[PDB]
A paper describes a structure:
While chemical methylation of an amide bond uses a strong base to generate the imidate, [name], the precursor protein of the fungal peptide macrocycle omphalotin A, self-hypermethylates amides at pH 7 using S-adenosyl methionine (SAM) as cofactor. Omphalotin A derives from the C terminus of the [name] protein, and it is the [name] protein that methylates its own C terminus using S-adenosyl methionine (SAM). The structure of [name] reveals a complex catenane-like arrangement in which the peptide substrate is clamped with its amide nitrogen aligned for nucleophilic attack on the methyl group of SAM. Here, we report the structure of the peptide amide methyltransferase [name] including complexes with cofactor [SAM and S-adenosyl homocysteine (SAH)], cofactor analog, substrate, and product.
Mutants Y63F, Y66F, Y76F, R72A, R72K, [name], Y98F, Q172A, and W400A of [name]ΔC6 were expressed in E. coli. Y76F and [name] led to highly aggregated protein, and only a small amount could be purified for analysis; very little folded material was obtained for Y98F, but no methylation was detected. Y76F, R72A, R72K, and [name] were unmethylated even after 3 days of overexpression in E. coli. During prolonged (12 days) incubation, there was some evidence for a very small amount of methylation in the [name] mutant (>100-fold reduced in vitro activity), but not in the Y76F mutant. The peptide carbonyl at i−3 hydrogen-bonds to the side chain of Tyr63, at i−2 to the side chain of Tyr98, and at i−1 to both Tyr66 and Tyr76. Tyr98 has plausible (but not ideal) Flippin-Lodge (−19°) and Bürgi-Dunitz (149°) angles. However, it is 5.5 Å from the carbonyl, its tetrahedral intermediate would create multiple clashes (with SAM, the side chain at position i and the main chain at position i−1), and no base is positioned to deprotonate it, leading us to exclude this mechanism. We speculate that the flipped conformation of the substrate (seen in R72A, [name], and Y76F SAM complex structures) resembles an intermediate arrangement that occurs during translocation.
Residue numbers in the entry:
A (entry chain A): 7 to 407
B (entry chain B): 7 to 410
The structure:
């Protein structure tokens, strides 16, 4: 309903490959691209994909306040939005994770009535989970900016994951082309010593930024971070992962109210699902092949799909259109403008496929692309009111479930 | 050296478009693909990219324990790894975020001496930050699985973001094709009432799973979650976001030790950097264009890049090879095996480009791809240290920083 749009997208952390297909598609479709990325291969890639790019990094300077820079970056984007253009902003990682100017620009554009969207990307924390072989679900995850962690005295949980961004320049972090002096690093180490003890592990993590490099996953004690040669390794792309120090016990009241007792008691609080977190101090070895695991594996020989399983049964024409809607922003905009008129223009759809697309309905799309068996709908009819998507994947964190 | 590998990748949350370029490239290059995705368009897309796919979802069944299913899913992948094949596992979102079988399979493969890697993807939490317009950095973020949150009595912080996954089946969540019965949801609501009060907002979040659908971003009070017509909207793809109830003050000792002085007038604890979190209750309106913002904008007219700014200055041949290494897993494997032989096979590189690639050094690559000015290297050489990457982007969360 008004000309002009702002879409902010991420590149991910590792050069080129961690960009999403949709982020690429918006970069190619844009009238104007504004980017801020440290990696030159990623910068070069972006410039091959759009003819009208501006490097936002040129608005930093020595002794020029970051906030003034962020104001300038956002204003450069919003000015093009105001002139009626489809503008794309590009930042490293996930563009809304530990980033100032993306949020500012989107809020401004939205407040003046323009279309404004952030697209998610792969963050440094996403990379951390992948490279350290941890899951934030087990046993929960606290994530802070290191200076904020200190200044606001943010609480830690010794029973959960802790991730600290921006450990490489605690306190004042004035822009400087020839680098930070992390002269207040000891204030962070002090806090870590108070919370965890001098012998507790801290993992220095740096995701590889090129496809070929290995990640830095260096474990140190809190005490070792005081050594000058170790402290010097922590720079502007360093993140700290602090593993839990202990395992939290279960709450008897909740166990009862959730009916997890079979007139009997749960797994011991250290009776872990394989694999254990390898960074956790004094982590005991967990057996991957218990008798129950071996029995489950034995059943694979006799396995067939359950009668309620819904095999995919689609067509080239339908997969092509669903792919086009995900990868062509213009096609998506058109479809959202008028489901019918779009659905009518698509070649080679069956009547069901056309109808489902026209209708705007997840269930219709599912039926069009999956063979739904009688035993599923008979069970969905005999119990309840109407059928929908069910049978969800689900992480088990507590041993009982 | 040992034959066989396992790479586990994500699809992201929204159909197709949230898969990474590298996830796609590994799916295409794999000898065998094992996938577990709910979205049929994503399943169809995967099947068009590799000829040898297996749907892991078929190993679920009614009243069959999920742990047994996960054991089976892992074992199917690891069997093909032990046979010396390049195997790819595909799960929704980020394949290591709230997922059991990926971690099991990788840990087994790795313990038996096979190459094993997880590639990150876009999670439902990444989607949540983007759709709710929040930054986990401001003012920190706590993330839990809902049943674990309750059973282990995990702490909340009323001053930070809280994100809860799997709110649609609190407690026993046995597999059922016709869906969960969320009859213990009240146990979660009681906990939220105790921690936050009955009138505090909870945001029911469901990311759009078709490119065209819109996100669900519905704000309710904790009390409203007890209404049957509201509680029934919560399902298997629901996540809750609970915004902070208050702003935390600064610590005077830390202010001093970090030298964020003088006078005793740091920014007030509610003096926010624009924009404010719109979900936070009684959030005061923040001014986007303060006098200093207007002055910064006035300087745009006379702006030129500083002396130390490094323009990109590369070639078609160099951007091509760097792109190939990011997008072609075979090409990358060759390059890592022998930098020199790979770099000498590459057509049309200049001597420096060739040389930088032979070395495998971030800094050599940067010099080959950017024009480094004298002002920058004269500053590095005056220090007595070789130049490296500096001038990092940095989020400002504490308002005192940025005022200095
Ligand atoms: C201003 S933030 C930007 C984060 C980015 N938007 C993201 O999605 O992660 C900079 C901080 O992110 C983290 N970071 C950036 N690159 C990284 C890397 N290669 N490895 C580990 N952490 C990184 C560090 O904590 C760094 O100080
Ligand atoms: C087994 S987990 C898997 C998460 C996935 N690996 C990821 O990266 O987010 C399932 C939970 O993820 C969250 N989730 C999955 N799809 C979602 C969506 N479309 N919107 C919001 N949350 C979602 C919900 O909390 C759901 O209960």
């Amino acid at each position: 309903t008004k000309a002009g749009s702002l879409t902010i997208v991420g590149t991910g952390i590792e050069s080129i490959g961690q960009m999403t297909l949709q982020a690429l598609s918006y970069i190619e479709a844009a009238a104007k691209v504004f980017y801020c990325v440290i990696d030159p291969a990623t910068e070069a890639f972006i410039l091959t994909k759009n003819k009208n790019c501006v490097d936002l990094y040129q608005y930093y300077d020595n002794g020029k306040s970051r906030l003034n820079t962020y104001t300038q970056m956002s204003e450069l984007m919003v000015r093009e939005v105001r002139k009626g253009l489809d503008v794309v902003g590009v930042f490293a990682g996930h563009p809304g994770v530990f980033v100032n100017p993306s949020h500012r620009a989107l809020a401004i554009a939205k407040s003046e009535g323009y279309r404004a969207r952030m697209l998610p990307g792969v963050s440094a924390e996403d990379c951390l989970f992948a490279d350290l072989c941890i899951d934030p679900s087990n046993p929960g995850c606290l994530t802070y900016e290191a200076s904020d962690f200190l200044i606001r005295d943010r609480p830690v949980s010794i029973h959960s994951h802790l991730v600290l961004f921006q450990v490489g320049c605690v306190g004042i972090a004035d822009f400087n082309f020839t680098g930070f002096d992390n002269n207040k690093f000891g204030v962070l180490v002090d806090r870590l010593e108070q919370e965890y003890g001098a012998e507790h592990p801290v993992v220095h993590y740096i995701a590889a930024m090129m496809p070929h490099q290995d990640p830095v996953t260096d474990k140190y004690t809190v005490a070792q971070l005081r050594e000058p040669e170790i402290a010097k390794r922590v720079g502007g792309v360093s993140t700290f992962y602090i593993p839990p120090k202990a395992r939290k016990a279960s709450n008897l009241d909740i166990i009862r109210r959730l009916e997890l007792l079979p007139a009997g008691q749960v797994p011991d609080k250290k009776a872990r699902i394989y694999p254990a977190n390898q960074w956790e101090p004094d982590v005991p070895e967990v057996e991957p092949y218990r008798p129950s695991d071996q029995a489950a594996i034995a059943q694979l020989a006799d396995h067939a799909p359950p009668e309620q399983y819904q095999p995919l049964a689609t067509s080239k024409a339908m997969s092509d259109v669903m792919t086009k809607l995900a990868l062509d922003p213009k096609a998506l905009a058109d479809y959202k403008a008028d489901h019918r008129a779009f659905a009518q223009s698509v070649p080679d759809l069956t009547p069901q496929e056309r109808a489902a697309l026209e209708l705007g309905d997840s269930w219709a799309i599912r039926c069009a692309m999956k063979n739904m068996p009688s035993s599923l709908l008979d069970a969905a009819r005999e119990s309840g009111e109407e059928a929908s998507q069910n049978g969800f994947p689900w992480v088990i964190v507590v041993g009982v479930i």
